[PDB]
Write a protein that binds this ligand. Structure first.
Ligand code: HEM
Length: 155
């Protein structure tokens, strides 16, 4: 399934650690994204009054958005590449409604790997990082193809 079975197992092993605290992981990933690439914050209209990390962590709205997003990503990862039916609506909303370039999906992928390694280093070594990188690369490639199918280059 594009990745090897062993690679998918490493992806899902670390994902199980994410699932012990989806809300906290989602908050940390978003905060890391906004800190590393501040232009991404402009895409979230309801979060622009959040000026500090503590304000972001206190926002129930932001926490809920993060949980919804990681839940969708987890459902995609669990399909081990067989994710067309789950990925198509996500592509539609992110291309046409939120207007998210593929580069921003690279930025959030970086943030995901950063948070996963920060929290779970003993379960996220080099081989697991490589597997997760391949899984997110596949996600980004397939969503870029769906963007094009909808008439969006995603640049
Ligand atoms: C792993 C990558 C991502 C996943 C799995 C994901 C998933 C989701 C899901 C499931 C939703 C709720 C339904 C929807 O509107 O589609 C959502 C909302 C949204 N996403 Fe993403 N997303 C990702 C990346 C991004 C990035 C990188 C940005 C911006 C830099 C972004 C911006 C937004 C915005 C603005 C919303 C609307 C939130 C709201 O108003 O409630 N997404 N995302």
């Amino acid at each position: 399934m594009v990745l090897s079975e062993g690679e998918w197992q490493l992806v899902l092993h670390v994902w199980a650690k994410v699932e012990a605290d989806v809300a906290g992981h989602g908050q940390d990933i978003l905060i890391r994204l906004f800190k590393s690439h501040p232009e991404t914050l402009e895409k979230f209209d309801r979060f622009k009054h959040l000026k500090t990390e503590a304000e972001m962590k206190a926002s129930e709205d932001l926490k809920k958005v993060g949980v919804t997003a990681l839940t969708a990503l987890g459902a995609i990862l669990k399909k081990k590449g067989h994710h067309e039916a789950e990925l198509k609506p996500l592509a539609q909303s992110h291309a046409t409604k939120h207007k998210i370039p593929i580069k921003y999906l690279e930025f959030i992928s970086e943030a995901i790997i950063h948070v996963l390694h920060s929290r779970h280093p003993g379960d996220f070594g080099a081989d697991a990082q490589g597997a997760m990188n391949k899984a997110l690369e596949l996600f980004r490639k397939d969503i870029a193809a769906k963007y094009k199918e909808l008439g969006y280059q995603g640049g």
